[PDB]
Design a protein around this ligand. Structure first.
Ligand SMILES: N[C@@H](Cc1c[nH]c[nH+]1)C(=O)O
Length: 323
């Protein structure tokens, strides 16, 4: 009853009193379980340090950094079903999103391990998802502390963004890939925090592939005339200020081009995750440098203290985050 949950097929299942082994279906889930309690994680989905997520050894437990890779259901990856089954997690937590649910449900049937799914596409859902996972894992006080900070940060951002008239919303281009020529649709789980932060995302469409990465030409970016450019890849961030042709863009002239922080988890994407609680504030601070009413460096410090148990010096803020 207290241990009864609706599973991925909407059927009530009874979990063990104590979950000592758990597996997340994809990095958004695994990263979230980490900050609640890494102890029961049987594995990770991707390499702990990769192109989009850096410096983990400085921020994350040694236990987490030494976990084996078991794959997952997400872009450019596939699950290791035999290994997952062999590792005997008490429960699997999955990512409830339409482009992944079919394949996930199929494979989970084959595995025959209890599985729950959580809906994290709207970042406003993070508080309730944290509380839910706290009940599942019997880590209620920890998960509730995270949920409360999440709720506060999300409410503050919502109230701020509501104060910006629609005609005054900052035009933003999300520059992905090594050459800045991939982007996301304005409606995509890869670009959600840009819209949540009050951005007018210049490329208009609806995501129809898991990975996104819509192709856009240089000539199209010029037409879009973004006011701010948010950049994922550090090679592009250098290129856009080194190569003369990008100086046609007003954002480049005004130096309103910003590299997304990645230490230890990406602040905005690859994966989408609870980091967006902070990342969307960081984005808002860049979109609205005169109107944004909070001190972003203090939000970073408070967020890292609670979520990661890490104290950041002013030099750390510069080194890892350019803040
Ligand atoms: N330079 C980091 C990102 C970053 C650091 N400070 C601000 N952003 C990278 O490797 O992508």
């Amino acid at each position: 009853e207290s241990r009864t949950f609706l599973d991925v097929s909407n059927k009530p299942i009874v979990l063990p009193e104590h979950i000592t082994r758990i597996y997340g279906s994809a990095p958004p889930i695994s990263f979230m379980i980490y900050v609640i309690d890494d102890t029961p994680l049987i594995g990770v989905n991707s390499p702990q340090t990769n192109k989009d997520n850096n410096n983990g050894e400085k921020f994350l437990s040694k236990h987490f950094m030494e976990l084996p890779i078991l794959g997952g259901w997400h872009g450019n990856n596939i699950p290791n079903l035999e290994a997952i089954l062999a590792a005997k997690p008490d429960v699997i937590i999955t990512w409830d999103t339409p482009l992944l649910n079919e394949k996930t449900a199929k494979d989970l049937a084959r595995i025959s391990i209890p599985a729950l799914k959580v809906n994290i596409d709207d970042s406003q859902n993070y508080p309730e998802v944290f509380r839910y996972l706290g009940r599942v894992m019997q880590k209620e006080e920890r998960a509730n502390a995270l949920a409360n900070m999440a709720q506060t940060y999300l409410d503050e951002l919502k109230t701020f963004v509501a104060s910006i008239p629609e005609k005054e919303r900052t035009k933003v281009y999300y520059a992905e890939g090594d050459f800045g020529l991939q982007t996301e649709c304005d409606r995509s789980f890869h670009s959600e925090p840009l819209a949540l932060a009050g951005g007018n995302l210049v490329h208009k469409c609806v995501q129809n592939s898991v990975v996104g990465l819509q192709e856009v030409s240089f000539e199209q970016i010029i037409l879009y005339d973004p006011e701010v450019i948010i950049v994922q890849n550090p090679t592009f961030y250098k290129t856009v200020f080194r190569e003369k042709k990008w100086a046609v863009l007003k954002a480049v002239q005004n130096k309103k081009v910003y590299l997304v922080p990645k230490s230890p988890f990406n602040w905005t994407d690859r994966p989408p995750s609870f980091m967006r609680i902070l990342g969307a504030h960081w984005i808002a601070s860049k979109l609205y440098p005169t109107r944004y009413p909070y001190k972003i460096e203090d939000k970073v410090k408070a967020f890292y203290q609670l979520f990661f148990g890490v104290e950041l010096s002013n030099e750390d803020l510069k080194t890892y985050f350019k803040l």
